Design a protein around this ligand. Structure first.
Ligand SMILES: */C=C\C(=O)NCCCNc1nc(N2CCCC2)nc2cc(OCCN)c(OC)cc12
Ligand SMILES: */C=C\C(=O)NCCCNc1nc(N2CCCC2)nc2cc(OCCN)c(OC)cc12
Lengths: 134, 139
């Protein structure tokens, strides 16, 4: 239904670009409707003890930012750790208080996935910008 | 003991300074022996449900970093949120993979407090630098 895109792992309709005056960002290359799946925030799904271990081990200054997103799913606390400098576009989508992408928890076979959903219609060539949807 | 230093918020023994090449840091103005209490990482103590609402409402870009520290306490997941720019020095202590300060969970009347203890002897004049508590099965 929508699990198909998650399992796919494809990241279609977006590309990397220099936003002139902004620096790096992710750009829509196709039109999105409100409600459409945009992209997964891909990362290791881990419990909170492993998250504390990884956090303590990563050789990163906290001033450069954190890729570890905590959330609660079915009474349990999880972490999606995108620290690995992957080639996934989801973790390079920039933030904005008034974004065109909101976060959603999507469950497949009991496993939570952190995905971005279009919160409005988006034009080809627009910058994809996320907000914490809650 | 450590506990009245914490509830008092008195943070003596350290001072803000600009370090050559680095910018703001916190400096030891007295000696600390290994194991001594240094400072609390002080913030609002909140449950994760409110951590997520706060995270969603802050107009902060993630590339300048996050003051929100998640941990588990007995049953629940809590968060220490030091986002607010306060008078408190714990949140300004820079990070290092080879620092002189370790985090630990210190409890006071059933409330978790995330504190920095000295991981080695610190001389006055040294910059305080923190790492997240090491995990070992040793004494
Ligand atoms: C992705 C891992 C990560 O960034 N974790 C952030 C955890 C919370 N943020 C900070 N936590 C602390 N302490 C934890 C307990 C002892 C200190 N300290 C800082 C210090 C910071 O800056 C100091 C000045 N450069 C920042 O900057 C955002 C965050 C945290
Ligand atoms: C103190 C709040 C905080 O920093 N929270 C961090 C949450 C995890 N970090 C990031 N999470 C996301 N998403 C969560 C779900 C949708 C997107 N995205 C980013 C993007 C980032 O960079 C964008 C490109 N500059 C960063 O940079 C560290 C972190 C997160």
């Amino acid at each position: 239904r929508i699990d198909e895109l998650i399992e796919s792992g494809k990241e279609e309709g977006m590309k990397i670009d220099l936003i002139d005056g902004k620096g790096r960002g992710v750009i829509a290359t196709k039109q999105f409707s409100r409600g459409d799946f945009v992209v997964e925030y891909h990362g290791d799904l881990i419990e909170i003890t492993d998250a504390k271990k990884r956090e303590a081990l990563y050789a990163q200054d906290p001033s450069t930012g954190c890729y570890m997103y905590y959330f609660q799913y079915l009474s349990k606390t999880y972490c999606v750790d995108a620290t690995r400098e992957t080639n996934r576009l989801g973790r390079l989508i920039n933030h904005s208080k008034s974004g065109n992408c909101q976060t959603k928890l999507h469950d497949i076979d009991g496993v939570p996935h952190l995905i971005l959903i279009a919160s409005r219609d988006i034009a080809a060539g627009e910058e994809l910008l996320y907000d914490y949807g809650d």
